[PDB]
């Protein structure tokens, strides 16, 4: 029909009642430009659409509507790596075209087949603090919690690039037997960021390794929400049909959450805690549910979402929600970054509750998990002692505390300090970790089972 009105990202159509929920419609501007949207609400003889593309210039009887008569599905192909796409279901970059062999829905249940069997295969990042203290699995979800003084993009790229070199070393070990694929999606970040990422992937290896979805900040909030959904379709097909392990790097996850926030402000929808939607739980879930092993059980989708915290607080709604849902927490610290530690990952609150699922034992040691717990415990004591060193001085602290202050300093500067291309095998990391444990005496290492301490020291 024709546009009735427009109030923000919501568009009021006066139409007829034949449309179905999320059925595509195309808005024909008087310029003769077509932009796409999907109906968010339908009522009798009228619709509310949210348009992906644009949010202004929308007329009345000079404008027209046309129905596509297909509710939105993403055209998925398995020849997607190396190929440049834009976050809009097609490239607007003029990159190699998407093609379709299935079109798969982004609602969060197309044909979805996931974990009835939990991850047991270890996948390494080449970084000790990640791998040893928390571990990463063939379905693991780990949030990178970052800040406005940390460079989020440099760490994001760091984890991805080094996990591509380690992952074939692990294929030979028989941790794997199937392909590796990267799906990189950037949604609504700066130009400066976008360019940087592409440059990073090229240096380490190639861009044949990865598939790229690029979405620009100048493009709307409505576009931004569809951008990860496009990533999900890509990854699920690859795992399902061609038994490939898929690694998704989703940047920026915070970018996506602010978008949700905008479609409740310029909607009449009342928001929940701290101005973030009440139905914020469901929006976030959609990304995280579509993870784990994929049917055949040689395919998988593994997630590393990248969150930048704006206030850097742990009372902000985004970091909290994400944490309950995700299988691990990786906290990256501004204070380490300042001191000259790269990567500057603080493990004080980094925790996995699904620690068993995260570790490996058939392509990693059984001792891996036992040592990690002890290390974490001994790091924590070393932090309690650090605060006490400032207050009390060395004028009353105990013999035991002194060992823990030394351990803390040796631990930051050796374990967490690694070259920009220097990759550590998980077995070598144990040897490093054992050096860290070795200064404490056999009565301070009392919590650990006697069997392990007498065996390996």
**Please, which residue, 172 or 396, has the CB nearer to another protein?**
396
Which parts are annotated binding residues?
353
Choices 111-119, 125-133, 175-183, 410-418; region in contact with another protein by CB under 8 A: 111-119
Name, in order, each residue with C-beta under 8 angstroms of 457's C-beta and a sequence gap of 6 or more.
434, 437, 438
Nearest to 81 by CA among 248, 203, 197: 248
Q: Choose which of 82, 95, 113, 296 interacts with another protein (CB under 8 A).
A: 113
338 part of the interface to another protein, by CB under 8 A: yes
Choices 113-121, 122-130, 159-167, 202-210; region in contact with another protein by CB under 8 A: 113-121
102 part of the interface to another protein, by CB under 8 A: no
Q: Which two tokens stand for residue 395?
A: 């004028």
> Mapping DSSP to helix (H, G, I), strand (E, B) and coil, where does residue 274 land?
helix
354 part of the interface to another protein, by CB under 8 A: yes
Which parts are annotated binding residues for ATP?
353
CB of 443 to another protein, least distance (A): 7
CB of 14 to another protein, least distance (A): 8
CB of 419 to another protein, least distance (A): 15
**Please, which residue, 81 or 222, has the CB nearer to another protein?**
222
Do 53 and 105 touch, CB atoms closer than 8 A?
Answer: no
**Please, which residue, 82 or 317, has the CB nearer to another protein?**
317
Kindly provide the residue ranges of all beta strands, DSSP E only, lying in 309-392, ordered along the sequence.
330-332, 345-346
Alpha-carbon torsion (444, 449, 454, 457), positive or negative: negative
> Mapping DSSP to helix (H, G, I), strand (E, B) and coil, where does residue 451 land?
helix
Interacting positions 399-438 with another protein (CB under 8 A): none
How far apart are alpha carbons 331 and 344 in whole angstroms? 9
Q: Choose which of 266, 422, 434, 435 interacts with another protein (CB under 8 A).
A: 266
How far apart are alpha carbons 137 and 373 in whole angstroms? 18
110 part of the interface to another protein, by CB under 8 A: yes
Query: What string of DSSP letters covers 126-168?
Result: S-HHHHTTT--BSS-B-PEEE-SSS-HHHHHHHHHHHHHHHHH
Interacting positions 269-308 with another protein (CB under 8 A): 269-279, 281-282, 285-286, 288-292, 295, 308
441 part of the interface to another protein, by CB under 8 A: no
Interacting positions 227-256 with another protein (CB under 8 A): 254-255
Beta partners for 50? 10, 38
CA angle in degrees (0–180, nearest 5) for 282-286-289: 115
Alpha-carbon torsion (31, 32, 36, 42), positive or negative: positive
Choices 125-133, 176-184, 268-276, 425-433; region in contact with another protein by CB under 8 A: 268-276
Q: How far is CA 355 from CA 267, 321, 373, 378, in A?
A: 41, 19, 10, 18
Query: What string of DSSP letters covers 224-264?
Result: HHHHHHHHHHHHHHHHHHH--EEEEEEE-HHHHHHHHHHHH
142 part of the interface to another protein, by CB under 8 A: no
CB of 169 to another protein, least distance (A): 25
**Please, which residue, 172 or 270, has the CB nearer to another protein?**
270
329 part of the interface to another protein, by CB under 8 A: yes
CB of 246 to another protein, least distance (A): 16
Nearest to 94 by CA among 107, 85, 82, 106: 85
Q: Choose which of 88, 181, 233, 357 interacts with another protein (CB under 8 A).
A: 357
398 part of the interface to another protein, by CB under 8 A: yes
Choices 76-84, 94-102, 112-120, 427-435; region in contact with another protein by CB under 8 A: 112-120
**Please, which residue, 168 or 340, has the CB nearer to another protein?**
340
CB of 172 to another protein, least distance (A): 26
CB of 156 to another protein, least distance (A): 13
**Please, which residue, 94 or 172, has the CB nearer to another protein?**
94
How far apart are alpha carbons 60 and 6 in whole angstroms? 9
Interacting positions 53-82 with another protein (CB under 8 A): 55-62, 71-72
35 part of the interface to another protein, by CB under 8 A: no
> Mapping DSSP to helix (H, G, I), strand (E, B) and coil, where does residue 293 land?
strand
Number of residues that bind another protein (CB under 8 A): 150
CB of 309 to another protein, least distance (A): 9
In degrees and rounded to multiples of 5, residue 74 shows phi and psi of -105, 130
């Amino acid at each position: 029909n024709t546009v009735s009105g427009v109030n923000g990202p919501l568009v009021i159509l006066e139409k007829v009642k034949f449309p179905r929920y999320n059925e595509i419609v195309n808005l024909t501007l008087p310029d003769g430009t077509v932009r796409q949207g999907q109906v968010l609400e339908i009522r009798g003889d009228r619709a509310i659409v949210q348009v992906f593309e644009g949010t202004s210039g929308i007329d009345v009887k000079k404008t027209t509507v046309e129905f596509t008569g297909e509710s939105l599905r993403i055209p998925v192909s398995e020849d997607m790596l190396g190929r440049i796409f834009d976050g809009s279901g097609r490239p607007i970059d003029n990159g190699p075209k998407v093609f379709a062999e299935d079109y798969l829905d982004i609602n969060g249940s197309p044909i979805n087949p996931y974990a009835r069997i939990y991850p047991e295969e270890m996948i390494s990042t080449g970084v000790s603090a990640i791998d040893t203290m928390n571990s990463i699995a063939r379905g693991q979800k780990i949030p990178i919690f970052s800040a406005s003084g940390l460079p989020h993009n440099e760490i994001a790229a760091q984890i991805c690039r080094q996990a591509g070199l380690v992952r074939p070393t692990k294929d030979v070990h028989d941790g794997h037997e199937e392909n590796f694929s990267i799906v990189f999606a950037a949604m609504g970040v700066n130009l400066e960021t976008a360019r940087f990422f592409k440059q990073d992937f090229e240096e380490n290896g190639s861009l044949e390794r990865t598939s790229l979805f690029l979405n620009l900040a100048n493009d709307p909030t409505i576009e931004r929400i569809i951008t990860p959904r496009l990533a999900l379709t890509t990854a699920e097909y690859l795992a399902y049909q061609t038994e490939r392990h898929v690694l998704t790097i989703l940047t920026d996850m915070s970018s996506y959450a602010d978008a949700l926030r905008e479609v409740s402000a310029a909607r009449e929808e009342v928001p929940g805690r701290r101005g973030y939607p009440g139905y914020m739980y469901t929006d976030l879930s959609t990304i995280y549910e579509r993870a784990g092993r994929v049917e055949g059980r040689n395919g998988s989708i593994t997630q590393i979402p990248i969150l930048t915290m704006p206030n850097d607080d742990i009372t902000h709604p985004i970091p909290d929600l994400t944490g309950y849902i995700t299988e691990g927490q990786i906290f990256v610290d501004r204070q380490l970054h300042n001191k000259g530690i790269y990567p500057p990952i603080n493990v004080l609150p980094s925790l996995s509750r699904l620690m068993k699922s995260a570790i490996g034992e058939g392509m990693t040691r059984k001792d891996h998990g036992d040592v990690s717990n002890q290390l974490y415990a001994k790091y924590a004591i070393g932090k309690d002692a650090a605060a006490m060193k400032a207050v009390v001085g060395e004028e009353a602290l105990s013999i035991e505390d002194k060992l823990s202050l030394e351990f803390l300093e040796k631990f930051e500067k050796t374990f967490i300090t690694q070259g920009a291309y220097e990759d550590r095998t998980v077995f070598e990391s144990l040897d490093q970790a054992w050096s860290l444990l070795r200064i404490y005496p056999k009565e301070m290492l009392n919590r650990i089972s006697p069997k392990i301490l007498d065996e390996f020291y």
